[PDB]
Amino acid sequence: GLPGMQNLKADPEELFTKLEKIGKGSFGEVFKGIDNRTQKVVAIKIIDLEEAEDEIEDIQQEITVLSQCDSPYVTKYYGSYLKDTKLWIIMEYLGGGSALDLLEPGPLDETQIATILREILKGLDYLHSEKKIHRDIKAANVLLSEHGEVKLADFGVAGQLTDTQIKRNTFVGTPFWMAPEVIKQSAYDSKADIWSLGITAIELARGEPPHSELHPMKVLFLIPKNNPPTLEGNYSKPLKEFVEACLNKEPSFRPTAKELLKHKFILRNAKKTSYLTELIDRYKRWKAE
Ligand SMILES: O=C(Nc1c[nH]nc1-c1nc2cc(CN3CCOCC3)ccc2[nH]1)NC1CC1
Ligand SMILES: [Cl-]
């Protein structure tokens, strides 16, 4: 049974006004929508179930993981509807778009970088405390509200640790951001997210992850065999050390999310999230051209 599944008599085309496409998830297409009862904006993920299966388990898993999260740092899930062969997944709308989108007008400053990383860390701390691993941390999966709030999204490949399953070994993620132990399919846990966080830190600083000019297949041997990436360029030493802390080949040498919240880069540079509205305004003016 799918968590949050609504009465099959309920017609989502009547309950929601479906508007323009705003992106593509690991599964399904995502639209801006209006809740016709409250008039709030929602995000609507639509998946065609007849074209799918072999992905249906994964879709169920994503919804299950979402339904089990209750955090200001994780996109809220409002339920699912079936219309003929299509599943409508109703999600919290984050009007600012992704951190990746917000990078298009130009570089971030280190206050912005620290603030976004701090909020991602709050989300990871929550997830890891719940014995969940995101496994696809990257700037495209970091979403901002219109108020500058920062939340984690796309739990399409998220994993769950139990007391009989202390580690995972599944090959999932986005290659440039994947930890060496995940690529090698060694036993791994929440520390894999910390590595991905390190890559995301470089992405927020430089605009792209390491190896971004290479074919994804090449990083399948490059990441396990090479020394870890470092942040190159004129960035503060605390930021460079934050990145180095995350990007260690030995998972036990990586700090926890909780520990990184106290890292000197974060404490010295992060400010209130409301300031990130400037970043949204910049994007708005930019795409206005
Ligand atoms: O779950 C997702 N998205 C969201 C959940 N809640 N809110 C969103 C969301 N996703 C958003 C994406 C954008 C970017 N625009 C897309 C259309 O072309 C101009 C830029 C802006 C606001 C957005 N809000 N998946 C991402 C789109 C692939
Ligand atoms: Cl740059």
Give the class-level CATH name of the largest domain. Answer: Mainly Alpha
Domains, number = 2
Radius of gyration of CA atoms, rounded to a whole number: 19 Å
N-to-C SSE string, H for helix and E for strand: HEEEHEEEHHEEEEHHHHHHH
What is bound: which ligands?
A: ligand 35R, chloride ion
Number of alpha- plus pi-helical segments: 11
Modified residues (Phosphothreonine): 170
Domain Protein kinase: 16-266
Protein name: Serine/threonine-protein kinase 24 36 kDa subunit
Binding site for Mg(2+): 141, 154
List its salient traits.
289 residues; alpha+beta; Phosphorylase Kinase, domain 1; Transferase(Phosphotransferase), domain 1; 2 domains; three-stranded antiparallel beta sheet; 10 strands; 34% helix; globular; binds the ligand O=C(Nc1c[nH]nc1-c1nc2cc(CN3CCOCC3)ccc2[nH]1)NC1CC1; binds chloride ion
Task: Describe the protein's architecture and organization.
The protein is an alpha+beta fold and 289 residues long. The chain folds into two domains: 1-93, 2-Layer Sandwich (Phosphorylase Kinase, domain 1), CATH 3.30.200; 94-289, Transferase(Phosphotransferase), domain 1, CATH 1.10.510. It is 34% helix and 17% strand. The chain has eleven helices and ten strands. The chain has helices at residues 12-15, 56-67, 99-102, 110-129, 180-183, 191-206, 219-225, 237-246, 257-260, 264-269, 277-288; strands at residues 16-24, 29-35, 41-48, 77-83, 86-92, 97-98, 132-133, 142-144, 150-152, 159-160. A five-stranded antiparallel sheet has the order 1-2-3-5-4. The termini are far apart. Chloride ion binds at residues 107, 206-207.
